[PDB]
């Protein structure tokens, strides 16, 4: 054994990650007021003399407002019918738009149903990427990036994962209510009788203190994918990052002397996403937003 006479772990913007390698860190913050989305993206170029390919670790963060709304339904005969529009699923995806780039890793890589999601992408010099479905107490990497998000009552699925694109869906699953657990497909999910016959639209639905954050507020994504570039090919590549929602409609009609009658319009508005196009310049190690927003 020779663990005692090993080299030092640390023998010695842009971060030096070891001999002949550095990470050039770029960021883009693109928001849409109309979409209620903020894409806060980190783009880390792995510049390594011992890795025959250029690599870009893309960490997708930011915010997707739930856009949950509670409204009157206009029209005679609908005075006692109210509508709640809410996100059944949050969509996060990255699609490559040029043949000279491919995706070589994705986090989360598998479906995850825990309330807390915390994972790590590690990089070791010479092109070695590794992933762990946990944070802390992992191996020894030259560089690492983590993802962290909470999805109470929702589950994360890999909807699509290939050399050109990755799509995750953070989908409604099971909710705690004062009347017991309810499935995301229960048509009575979130409805309630208002306090009186003149009760506002908001009163026909579960109060804020009963709605989990992905329904009441929104989602704070935290996802990773690494783009691989075959050297010799074009210095530039384009790709799109999409953040959005699939919305359901819940209708609640009050029959004052009887109670509530509920209806669900499932998948009422699908793939309602904010798409941003970016261009990687592998030569200058730069990112620019195409068209912007
Ligand atoms: N915007 C679209 O065309 C996509 N979707 C829209 C939606 O269902 O909300 C329908 C489809 O094309 O199947």
Numbering used by the authors: 12 to 23, 31 to 311
Task: Give sentences copied directly from the paper behind this entry.
LukED targets specific G protein-coupled chemokine receptors to lyse human erythrocytes (red blood cells) and leukocytes (white blood cells). Each leukotoxin is made up of two subunits of approximately 30 kDa: a host cell targeting S-component (HlgA, HlgC, LukE, lukS-PV, and LukA/G), and a polymerization F- component (HlgB, LukD, lukF-PV, and LukB/H), which can bind the plasma membrane through highly conserved phosphocholine binding sites. Each toxin is composed of two domains: a central β sandwich called the CAP domain and involved in inter-protomer interactions, and a RIM domain which contains several divergent loops driving host cell specificity.
While attempting to co-crystallize LukE in complex with peptides encompassing the sulfated ACKR1 Tyr41 residue, we serendipitously obtained two additional apo crystal forms of LukE at 1.5 Å (apo1) and 1.9 Å (apo2), allowing us to build a higher quality model.
